[PDB]
């Protein structure tokens, strides 16, 4: 019970951290549609190509 | 001066405390300021939050996508038009004359000669005979960046 | 033509999506247009639906009770005025010039030289006149829908 | 000219009555229900007073200096439609002129709430000689 | 419009407040800081009345006869000021909105006599109601502070 509990909280906290970073990665580019989205960021903080 | 229509005010307890502006088929509004945008179609959209820029941003709905401003990061220093008058850009700082703007002028777009928005104003600090504006701009690469002179106070 | 502000533009997301026409002390709108009437007093009434005829109907309040379009089931073939121009009734078919009307112009009445003769709901491009889908009222005066084959809602 | 500052209430899209701001507080009679037709006064929550038949409330911050001003001295006065044995009479304002202040040198000395045709007296709220608020309501008054 | 007597209070070459010599005594608002641009005046010991937000001292003997006079008679109406008009009404010192502001506190109000020393305000609709230290009906010094007044 403890081990499922600790893996659950760690996994949820990790995914929360990651999705937070995902947002904080895309939003600068999201907001500024006309810039170039660096390829590395494009593939890693995986992104739609905006117009 | 004529494109200033597309910014519309927010109503907070019945009074205007700020403005929401539509650019790039995306409506923006400062986070710090509360209210409901004074029109119906833009009142509906769930506005997503961007704390690190103090900007709530949302996807303007369909039928007025072609009715929005454009923007560029190309910002040579000089005079740039703005609702209350000109804003002089120099030493990587936007500054308007002393005392113009204040409470309620947040979210006001700053345009260039060709109607393209260069920044949205969020605050200010009065230095000497001028007042420097804390804004949200796009850098030379063009990613969004909050620019705040020291001691800027939200509007 | 001018006695048309009895007819009221409904609004969906701020722009006029269709029109709701007051005839006979009753507000009509078509189902296929969704949205809100652009009038507070008309915004209240519970509109009862009728799919077979594709109309939602409501009893008007008193304040406009005497100020409502009349109708008529007498429809000789001929020209009947309509907001966007005349309509021609011939071969028991309501038609308009090719290229006038379309999305949004549903639910605008057809009047004669001024009682309602039909309320329009759609249309198919016949030819160089364009046939219309209308809820006409038959010679007995019971309401009926009139669809050329393959017409689509406006 | 200051009648602009009696704000018409709306209910179901018609003028059910009016509400007025005097002395830095807004005033709306109970009987006439409605949404006030003004955004900045819409957000004041009106605390009721049945015994004077007026819900009232302190006006928002940014209109304290733009209220009409009253006074209790009423020698036996002007009013929206054109009005004083200690009784306000005027035969032919009716069903909807509820809450209409009755001005004087631009002071309000009453708010009208209803009336009875003395075939026509006004059911009114005033302020007495010592200045305390009181309702003066004629026998047979109907609200408007 | 006797402007020699008036000294701005100086920080870094800009005006932050106004301290006035009235009736042979220097008064200033306590919350404003700084120095008079005058060699003789600046050294004088100033004594505080915290409740009133008023600092007072004695001006030197040489300037005792060259100070503006004060008077407590303030009927409702209009008074002269450098930027325009000052209203008295209903026991409020009122000004039309947007004339006057920060760094104006302590400014004396002239008819030329001083009747009331502004310390603050609040801008309300079409009119700014002034927080001011006055003399009551019996001549006693009293602060009148409208609710929510931000000191100027």
């Amino acid at each position: 019970c403890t081990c499922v509990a600790i893996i659950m909280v760690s996994c949820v906290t990790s995914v929360w951290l990651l999705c937070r970073t995902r947002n904080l990665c895309i939003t600068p580019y999201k907001l500024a549609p006309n810039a170039q989205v660096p390829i590395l960021l494009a593939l890693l903080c995986c992104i739609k190509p905006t117009r | 001066k004529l494109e200033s229509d597309k910014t519309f005010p927010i109503m907070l307890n019945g009074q205007v405390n700020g403005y929401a502006c539509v650019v790039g088929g995306r409506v923006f509004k400062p986070l710090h300021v509360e209210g409901r945008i004074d029109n119906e179609q833009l009142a509906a959209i769930k506005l997503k939050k961007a704390s690190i820029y103090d900007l709530e941003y949302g996807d303007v709905p369909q039928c007025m996508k072609s009715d929005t401003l454009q923007y560029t990061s190309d910002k040579p220093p000089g005079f740039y038009n703005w609702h209350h008058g000109a804003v002089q850009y120099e030493n990587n700082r936007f500054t308007v004359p002393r005392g113009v703007g204040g409470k309620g002028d947040s979210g006001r777009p700053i345009l260039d000669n060709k109607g393209r928005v260069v920044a949205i104003v969020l605050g200010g600090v009065n230095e000497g005979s001028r007042t420097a504006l804390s804004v949200v701009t796009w850098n030379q690469k063009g990613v969004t960046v909050k620019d705040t002179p020291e001691g800027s106070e939200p509007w």
Side-chain angles (χ1 to χ4, degrees), chain A, chain B:
Chain A
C1 284
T2 46
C3 95
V4 56
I6 76 87
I7 178 68
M8 243 300 274
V9 56
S10 90
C11 155
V12 82
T13 319
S14 60
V15 85
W16 172 72
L17 258 302
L18 258 291
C19 271
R20 175 155 119 75
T21 279
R22 201 207 189 277
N23 273 1
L24 270 62
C25 270
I26 52 164
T27 51
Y29 289 97
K30 216 206 289 292
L31 276 185
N34 307 143
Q36 304 302 338
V37 176
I39 321 91
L40 297 66
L41 254 293
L43 294 144
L44 220 51
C45 279
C46 84
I47 219 164
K48 290 270 315 322
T50 326
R51 315 185 169 74
Chain B
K1 287 192 182 179
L2 155 64
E3 320 78 296
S4 209
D5 59 298
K6 310 185 185 166
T7 166
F8 331 105
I10 48 166
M11 279 346 283
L12 171 40
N13 299 341
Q15 193 35 229
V16 50
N17 39 323
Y19 290 90
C21 154
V22 84
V23 54
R26 214 162 291 272
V27 71
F28 302 159
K29 111 172 182 46
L31 211 83
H32 73 306
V33 83
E34 176 31 17
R36 171 214 62 76
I37 183 62
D38 196 31
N39 97 336
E40 262 217 84
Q41 60 214 326
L42 314 191
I45 309 112
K46 179 69 221 68
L47 266 289
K48 330 286 296 323
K49 185 259 274 185
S51 99
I52 64 197
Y53 306 139
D54 200 324
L55 224 68
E56 237 154 73
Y57 71 103
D59 262 300
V60 56
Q62 160 54 39
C63 93
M64 72 321 299
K65 258 209 183 77
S66 51
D67 192 43
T68 206
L69 288 323
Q70 48 218 99
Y71 81 102
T72 88
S73 83
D74 172 352
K75 49 198 90 194
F79 278 102
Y80 285 71
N81 53 325
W82 159 62
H83 188 210
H84 304 1
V87 47
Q88 68 196 142
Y89 191 22
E90 192 176 36
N91 55 277
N92 274 336
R93 242 71 159 171
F94 283 127
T95 198
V96 285
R98 186 185 185 205
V100 81
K103 170 27 157 28
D105 206 354
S106 95
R108 194 71 90 199
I110 288 157
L111 286 56
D112 53 10
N113 52 339
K114 327 200 169 58
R116 314 191 269 89
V117 57
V118 163
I120 315 302
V121 317
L122 296 102
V125 86
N126 161 212
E127 44 178 304
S129 59
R130 207 77 190 169
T131 181
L133 310 115
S134 97
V135 290
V136 48
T137 89
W138 309 265
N139 73 346
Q140 336 79 52
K141 252 293 169 297
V143 295
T144 40
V145 172
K146 177 175 277 295
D147 205 327
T148 280
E150 160 163 13
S152 147
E153 294 284 321
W155 289 359

